[PDB]
């Protein structure tokens, strides 16, 4: 099966999908994020961050407090399973992670930690 997905964030706060499926036979998985908007990352930055559902709000809140220079992620945040850099217009970044970090039946969320963005810039990730 395919073990990658292409995700975009633009000059609005929604990703172009709200649900990612990771096939259970995949051993790694890659997310390729890009930003087809015109605004720079300090104004309309997006990252793609994966945590358990339970951990999402903490990661978002602590990430906002960490600021732009930390890509809006608390340093040494063990709650983050995988993530990309924060990108702006014209940029791109990919993350590959081990599917051994995921289990069937567990509830995962992906989201952007740029301030305010998680309200609309979030979705589920499911191993199946």
Instruction: Using CB under 5 A, list all residues that contact Cu ion.
Output: 46, 112, 114, 117, 121
Give whichever of 49 and 127 is closer to Cu ion, judged by the CB atom: 49
Cα 70 to Cα 2, 22, 92, 114, 123: the distances in Å are 32, 28, 17, 11, 23
The distance of closest approach from Cβ of residue 4 to Cu ion in the complex, given in angstroms and rounded to an integer, is: 20
Neighbouring C-alpha atoms within 13 Å toward the C-beta of 18:
7
The distance of closest approach from Cβ of residue 3 to Cu ion in the complex, given in angstroms and rounded to an integer, is: 21
Give whichever of 12 and 24 is closer to Cu ion, judged by the CB atom: 12
User: How big is the chain, counted in residues?
Assistant: 128
Torsion of CA 44, 16, 57, 84, to 10 degrees: -70
The distance of closest approach from Cβ of residue 128 to Cu ion in the complex, given in angstroms and rounded to an integer, is: 26
> Which tokens in the block code for residue 68?
């732009």
The distance of closest approach from Cβ of residue 103 to Cu ion in the complex, given in angstroms and rounded to an integer, is: 21
Nearest to 103 by CA among 60, 58, 52, 59: 52
Give whichever of 21 and 97 is closer to Cu ion, judged by the CB atom: 97
- Residue number with the smallest Cβ distance to Cu ion: 112
Give whichever of 2 and 28 is closer to Cu ion, judged by the CB atom: 28
Classify 109 as helix, strand or coil.
Answer: strand
């Amino acid at each position: 099966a395919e073990c990658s997905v292409d995700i975009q964030g633009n000059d609005q706060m929604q990703f172009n999908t709200n649900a990612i499926t990771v096939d259970k036979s995949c051993k790694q998985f890659t997310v390729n994020l890009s930003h087809p908007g015109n605004l720079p990352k300090n104004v309309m930055g997006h990252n793609w961050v994966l945590s358990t559902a339970a951990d999402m709000q903490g990661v978002v809140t602590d990430g906002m407090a960490s600021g732009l220079d930390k890509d809006y992620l608390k340093p040494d945040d063990s709650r983050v399973i995988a993530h990309t850099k924060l990108i702006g217009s014209g940029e791109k970044d990919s993350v590959t992670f081990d599917v051994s970090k995921l289990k069937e039946g567990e509830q995962y969320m992906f989201f952007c930690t740029f301030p305010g963005h998680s309200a609309l810039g979030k979705g589920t990730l499911t191993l199946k």
